Amino acid sequence: GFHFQQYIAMAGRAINPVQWTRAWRRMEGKSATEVYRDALAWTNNQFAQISRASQYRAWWWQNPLGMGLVLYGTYKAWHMIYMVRKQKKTAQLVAAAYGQGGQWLNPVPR
Amino acid sequence: GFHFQQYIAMAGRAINPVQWTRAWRRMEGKSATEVYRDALAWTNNQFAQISRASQYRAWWWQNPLGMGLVLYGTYKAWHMIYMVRKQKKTAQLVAAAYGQGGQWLNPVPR
Amino acid sequence: HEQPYRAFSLGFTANNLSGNWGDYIDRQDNKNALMRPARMMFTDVFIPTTK
Amino acid sequence: MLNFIPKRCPSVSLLFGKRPVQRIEVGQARHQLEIPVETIEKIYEGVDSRLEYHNKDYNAMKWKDFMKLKLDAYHLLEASQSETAAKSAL
Amino acid sequence: YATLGSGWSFSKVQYTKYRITKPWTTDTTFDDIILSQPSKEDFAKFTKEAPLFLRFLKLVTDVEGRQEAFIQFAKRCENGLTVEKDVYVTKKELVDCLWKNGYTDTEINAFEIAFPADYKFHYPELAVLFDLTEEDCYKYCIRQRAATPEELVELKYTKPKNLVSSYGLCFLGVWFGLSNTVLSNAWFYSKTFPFGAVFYMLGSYFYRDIREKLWKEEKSLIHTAQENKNMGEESVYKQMKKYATDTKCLDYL
Ligand SMILES: CCCCCCCCCCCCCCCCCC(=O)OC[C@H](COP(=O)([O-])OCC(O)COP(=O)([O-])OC[C@@H](COC(=O)CCCCCCCCCCCCCCCCC)OC(=O)CCCCCCCCCCCCCCCCC)OC(=O)CCCCCCCCCCCCCCCCC
Ligand SMILES: CCCCCCCCCCCCCCCCCC(=O)OC[C@H](COP(=O)([O-])OCC(O)COP(=O)([O-])OC[C@@H](COC(=O)CCCCCCCCCCCCCCCCC)OC(=O)CCCCCCCCCCCCCCCCC)OC(=O)CCCCCCCCCCCCCCCCC
Ligand SMILES: CCCCCCCCCCCCCCCCCC(=O)OC[C@H](COP(=O)([O-])OCC(O)COP(=O)([O-])OC[C@@H](COC(=O)CCCCCCCCCCCCCCCCC)OC(=O)CCCCCCCCCCCCCCCCC)OC(=O)CCCCCCCCCCCCCCCCC
Ligand SMILES: CCCCCCCCCCCCCCCCCC(=O)OC[C@H](COP(=O)([O-])OCC(O)COP(=O)([O-])OC[C@@H](COC(=O)CCCCCCCCCCCCCCCCC)OC(=O)CCCCCCCCCCCCCCCCC)OC(=O)CCCCCCCCCCCCCCCCC
Numbered sequence: 189g190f191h192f193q194q195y196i197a198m199a200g201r202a203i204n205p206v207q208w209t210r211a212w213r214r215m216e217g218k219s220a221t222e223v224y225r226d227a228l229a230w231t232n233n234q235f236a237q238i239s240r241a242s243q244y245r246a247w248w249w250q251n252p253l254g255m256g257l258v259l260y261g262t263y264k265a266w267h268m269i270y271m272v273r274k275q276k277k278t279a280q281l282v283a284a285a286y287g288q289g290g291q292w293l294n295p296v297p298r
Numbered sequence: 299g300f301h302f303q304q305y306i307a308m309a310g311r312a313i314n315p316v317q318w319t320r321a322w323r324r325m326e327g328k329s330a331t332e333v334y335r336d337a338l339a340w341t342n343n344q345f346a347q348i349s350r351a352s353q354y355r356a357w358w359w360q361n362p363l364g365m366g367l368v369l370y371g372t373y374k375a376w377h378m379i380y381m382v383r384k385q386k387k388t389a390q391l392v393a394a395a396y397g398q399g400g401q402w403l404n405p406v407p408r
Numbered sequence: 409h410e411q412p413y414r415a416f417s418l419g420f421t422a423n424n425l426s427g428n429w430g431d432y433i434d435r436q437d438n439k440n441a442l443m444r445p446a447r448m449m450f451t452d453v454f455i456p457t458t459k
Numbered sequence: 460m461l462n463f464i465p466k467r468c469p470s471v472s473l474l475f476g477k478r479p480v481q482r483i484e485v486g487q488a489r490h491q492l493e494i495p496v497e498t499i500e501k502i503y504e505g506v507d508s509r510l511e512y513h514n515k516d517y518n519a520m521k522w523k524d525f526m527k528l529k530l531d532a533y534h535l536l537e538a539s540q541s542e543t544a545a546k547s548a549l
Numbered sequence: 550y551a552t553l554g555s556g557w558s559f560s561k562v563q564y565t566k567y568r569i570t571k572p573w574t575t576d577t578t579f580d581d582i583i584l585s586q587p588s589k590e591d592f593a594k595f596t597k598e599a600p601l602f603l604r605f606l607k608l609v610t611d612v613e614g615r616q617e618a619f620i621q622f623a624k625r626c627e628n629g630l631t632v633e634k635d636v637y638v639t640k641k642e643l644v645d646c647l648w649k650n651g652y653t654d655t656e657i658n659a660f661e662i663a664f665p666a667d668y669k670f671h672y673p674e675l676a677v678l679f680d681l682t683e684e685d686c687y688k689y690c691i692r693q694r695a696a697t698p699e700e701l702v703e704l705k706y707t708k709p710k711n712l713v714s715s716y717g718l719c720f721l722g723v724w725f726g727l728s729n730t731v732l733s734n735a736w737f738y739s740k741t742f743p744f745g746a747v748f749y750m751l752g753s754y755f756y757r758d759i760r761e762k763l764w765k766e767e768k769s770l771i772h773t774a775q776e777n778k779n780m781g782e783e784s785v786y787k788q789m790k791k792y793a794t795d796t797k798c799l800d801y802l
C-alpha cells in the first residue's frame with residue numbers, strides 16, 4: 189500500500205464541483221473505452237509500483253506483518269465507516285417498523 | 299520519545315514475581331540513595347538520548363509536529379487507561395449512593 | 409408439514425441459535441442473565457435510552 | 460540463453476555501432492572476447508520488432524534463427540564434453 | 550515495473566525503526582523515482598563546474614574534427630552548466646559501456662586519467678561528447694538510475710494539496726467510524742486483538758526463520774541457473790578457441 193494521502197486528495201477533488209465542469213470539458217472527444225483503459229492503467233501502475241518497490245524499499249509503516257497490516261487496516265476502516273453506518277440505519281429502521289429484534293422473531297404460533 | 303516496547307517489557311518483568319525474588323537478592327548490600335541515583339540516572343539517560351539523537355535522526359513516527367504528537371499520545375493513553383477508568387468507578391459509586399448526578403444536586407430548599 | 413419454520417443463521421461470525429427473541433406479542437431477551445448487564449459489548453452500534 | 464536482444468537505439472544501448480567491435484566477458488573467470496559488429500548485426504535481421512520485453516528494451520528473434528543459434532551452441536558444448544570430437548570443423 | 554540491472558546477486562533487505570534523512574534544503578525534497586514518476590521539470594537543477602570536462606571535450610573534438618560543437622557548448626556552459634541534479638551516469642558504467650561497445654584502450658585510459666572515480670556525467674555532457682541527442686542521453690541516464698532505485702532522487706519541493714477537502718473527508722471518516730462500539734466489542738477482545746497480537750508476536754519472533762525458509766528455494770534456483778550459464782559459456786568459448794585455427798587452410802592452399 190501507498191499514497192493514501194493522494195487518494196484522499198483525489199476524493200476531495202472529485203467531490204469538488206468545479207472539477208465536475210473541468211471533467212465535462214475534458215470529456216470532449218473521448219470514448220468510454222479510453223476512460224476505462226486509463227482507469228485500469230492507473231490501478232495497474234499503483235499495483236506495479238508496489239510489486240517493484242517492495243523488493244528494496246520500506247515504508248514508515250513497515251512491520252513484521254508487512255503490507256498485510258495496512259490492507260487489514262484499509263478493510264477495517266471501510267467496514268467501520270460504511271458497513272457499520274448501514275447497520276445503524278438498518279437497526280433504526282427495524283426498531284421503527286417491528287421493534288428491536290423484529291427481524292429475528294419466531295413465526296406466529298399455530 | 300523512544301523505546302516504548304522496552305518500557306512495556308520492563309513493566310512486564312516488574313510484575314513477574316520471580317523478578318521480585320531476583321530484586322530481593324540484588325538489594326543485598328544496597329542503599330536508598332544508590333537506588334534513587336540509579337533511577338534518576340536512567341531517566342536522565344533516556345532524555346539525553348532524545349536530546350542528542352533528535353538533532354540528526356528521525357523515528358518511524360516522525361511527523362510535522364515531531365515528538366509533540368508522541369507525547370500527546372502518551373498523555374491520551376494514560377488518560378483513557380487510568381483516569382476514565384477511575385471516572386467509571388466513581389460514576390457507579392455515586393449512582394449507588396445518591397443516584398446518577400447526585401454530586402451535582404442543589405442544596406435542600408429552606 | 410403445515411407448521412412453519414424458524415429462520416436459520418449460522419456462521420463463524422454470528423448465529424441465531426444462542427438465543428430466542430420470542431413471538432411478536434410474547435417477546436423475551438435473547439441474552440441470558442449473566443451477560444444482560446453487558447449487552448453493549450455484544451453490539452456494533454448502540455443507541456441508548458432517553459432519560 | 461534467452462531470446463532477449465537489446466535494442467540498438469541509443470536510448471537503450473548507448474554507443475552500439477560507434478565502433479566496429481563488441482566485447483564481452485565470458486564465464487566465472489570473465490575471459491575477454493571480441494566480436495565483429497557485422498557478425499552481431501546479422502542478428503537484427505531475424506529480430507522481430509512486434510515483440511518487446513523488459514521495459515520495452517529487448518526485442519525477440521524469430522524462433523527459427525534463435526533455435527539454430529541454440530543448436531550451434533549445444534553442438535559445440537557436447538563436442539567439448541566428448542572426447543572423440545573432430546579436431547576441426549571442416 | 551520491471552527489475553532493471555545486470556547483477557546476479559540475490560539481494561534482500563532488512564528494515565530499521567529509523568527513517569532516511571537528507572541534508573536540509575528549503576526548495577528540494579528527496580523521493581523514490583519509481584514511486585514519484587517525476588518529469589524533467591519536477592527534477593531539481595543545479596550548477597556544475599565545466600573546466601575539468603571542457604578540457605577533455607576540447608581534446609575529443611580536436612581528435613574527431615568538430616570544433617563548432619565545443620565552441621557552442623562552452624559558450625552555453627560558461628558560468629557553470631545548469632542541469633538536472635539526479636540525472637547522471639557514473640564513470641564506471643560509462644567505462645563498461647565503452648569497453649563492451651569497442652572503444653580503444655587508449656581512449657578508455659584517457660577517460661580514466663582525466664576524470665576522478667566519483668565523477669558523474671550528465672546527459673548534456675554525454676550528448677556533446679558522443680554526438681547524440683540530449684533526449685536519448687536523458688532516457689539512458691533515467692534507465693541507469695532506475696537500475697539502482699535504492700538511491701533517492703531530488704525533486705522540487707511542492708506544498709501539500711487539497712488539505713481543506715482532506716480535513717473535511719477525514720472528519721467525516723471519524724464521525725462515521727468512531728461513533729460505534731467496535732473497538733469495545735466482545736468480538737474485538739476475543740478474536741481481533743488475540744489473533745492479531747499472536748500473529749504479530751509470532752512474526753516478530755520468527756521474522757527471519759520464515760524469510761529464510763521461504764527464500765531457500767529461490768536462492769538454490771538462482772545458484773543453479775548461474776552455474777549452468779557459466780559452464781555452458783566456458784565450454785563454448787574453449788571449443789571455439791580450439792576451432793579458431795581452421796581458416797588458415799585456405800591461405801596455405
Ligand atoms: C483516531 C485513530 C483511530 C481512527 C479510527 C479507528 C480506525 C481503526 C482502523 C485503523 C486503520 C488505519 C488505516 C491503515 C491504512 C494505512 C493508513 C496510512 O498508513 O496512511 C495514513 C496517512 C499517511 O499517508 P501516507 O500515504 O503514508 O503518506 C504520508 C505523507 O507523505 C506524510 O509523510 P510524514 O513523514 O510527514 O508523516 C507520515 C505519517 C506519520 O504517521 C505516524 O507515524 C504517526 C505519528 C505519531 C506516532 C503515534 C501515533 C498515534 C498517536 C498520535 C496520533 C494520534 C492519531 C492516531 C493516528 C493513527 C495512525 C498512526 O503521517 C501521518 O499519517 C499523520 C497521522 C497523524 C495525524 C494527526 C492528526 C491529529 C488530529 C486528531 C487529533 C489528535 C488525535 C486524537 C486522539 C486519537 C486517538 C485514537 O495519514 C493521514 O491521515 C494523511 C493525512 C492527510 C492530511 C489530512 C488533513 C489533516 C487531518 C488529520 C487526520 C488525518 C486522518 C487520520 C485520522 C486519525 C486522527 C483522528
Ligand atoms: C487500537 C488503537 C487505539 C488504541 C487505544 C486508543 C488510544 C488513543 C491514543 C493513542 C496514543 C498512542 C500512543 C503514542 C505514544 C507512542 C507509541 C509508539 O509510537 O510506540 C508504540 C509501540 C512501538 O514501540 P517503539 O518504541 O516505537 O519500537 C518499535 C520496535 O522497535 C518495533 O520496530 P518495527 O519497525 O518492527 O515496528 C514499529 C512499529 C510500527 O508501527 C506502525 O507503523 C503501524 C504499522 C501499520 C500502519 C497502520 C497503523 C494503523 C492500522 C494497523 C494497526 C492497527 C492497530 C493500531 C495501531 C495504532 C498505532 C499506529 O511497531 C508497532 O508499533 C506495532 C503496532 C501494531 C501492532 C498490531 C497489533 C495488532 C493487535 C490488535 C488487532 C489489530 C487492530 C485492531 C483494530 C484496531 C483499530 C483501532 O508499539 C507497540 O505497541 C509495541 C508492541 C510490543 C509488543 C506487545 C505484544 C503485542 C501486542 C500488540 C499490541 C501492542 C499495543 C498496540 C495497541 C494497538 C492495537 C490494539
Ligand atoms: C436439522 C439439522 C440441521 C443441521 C445444520 C445443517 C446446516 C445447513 C445445511 C448445510 C449444508 C452444507 C453446506 C456447506 C456449508 C455452508 C457454508 C456457508 O454457506 O457459509 C455460510 C456462512 C455465512 O452465512 P451468513 O448467513 O451470511 O452469516 C452471516 C454473515 O456471514 C455475516 O457477515 P459478516 O458481518 O460477519 O462479514 C463477514 C465479512 C468477512 O470479510 C473478510 O473476512 C475479509 C477480510 C479481508 C481483510 C484483508 C483484505 C486485504 C485485501 C486488500 C485488497 C487490496 C486493497 C483494496 C481495498 C478494499 C478491500 C479491502 O464478509 C465476508 O464474509 C466476505 C466473503 C466474500 C469474500 C471471500 C474472500 C475469499 C478469499 C480467499 C483467499 C484464499 C487465499 C488462500 C491463500 C493460501 C495461503 C498461501 O459462512 C460464514 O461463516 C461466513 C464467514 C466465512 C468466512 C470467510 C472468511 C474469508 C477471509 C479471507 C481472508 C484471506 C486472507 C488470507 C491471508 C493469508 C495470506 C497472507
Ligand atoms: C436533491 C436534494 C439535494 C440537493 C441539494 C444539494 C446540495 C449541494 C450543496 C453544494 C455543495 C456540494 C458539496 C461540495 C462542497 C464543496 C467542497 C469543496 O470544494 O471544498 C474544498 C475547497 C477547495 O480547497 P482544497 O481542496 O483544500 O484545495 C483545492 C484548491 O482550493 C483549488 O480549488 P479549485 O481551483 O478547484 O476551486 C476553487 C474554488 C473552491 O471553492 C469551493 O469551495 C467550491 C464551492 C462551489 C459550490 C457550488 C455549489 C453548486 C451546487 C448548488 C447550486 C448553488 C447555485 C450557485 C451555482 C454556482 C454559480 C454561482 O473557489 C475558491 O477556492 C476561491 C476562488 C473562487 C473562484 C470562483 C469559484 C466559483 C466558480 C463558479 C461556480 C462554479 C459552479 C460549477 C457548476 C456546478 C454544477 C453542478 O476548499 C473548501 O473547503 C472551501 C470551503 C468549504 C465550503 C463551505 C464553507 C463553510 C460554509 C458551510 C456552509 C454552512 C454549513 C451548512 C449549513 C447550511 C444551512 C443552509
Ligand SMILES: CCCCCCCCCCCCO[C@@H]1O[C@H](CO)[C@@H](O[C@H]2O[C@H](CO)[C@@H](O)[C@H](O)[C@H]2O)[C@H](O)[C@H]1O
Nearest residue numbers: 417418419422423424425426427428438439440441442
Ligand atoms: C449445529 C450445531 C453446531 C453449531 C453450533 C452453533 C452455535 C451454538 C450456539 C451457542 C451454544 C450456547 O448457547 C447458550 O446456551 C443456550 C442456547 O440456547 C442459551 O441459554 C438460554 O436458552 C436456554 C434454553 O435451552 C435456557 O435454558 C437458558 O436459561 C437461557 O439462558 C444461551 O443464551 C446461550 O449463550
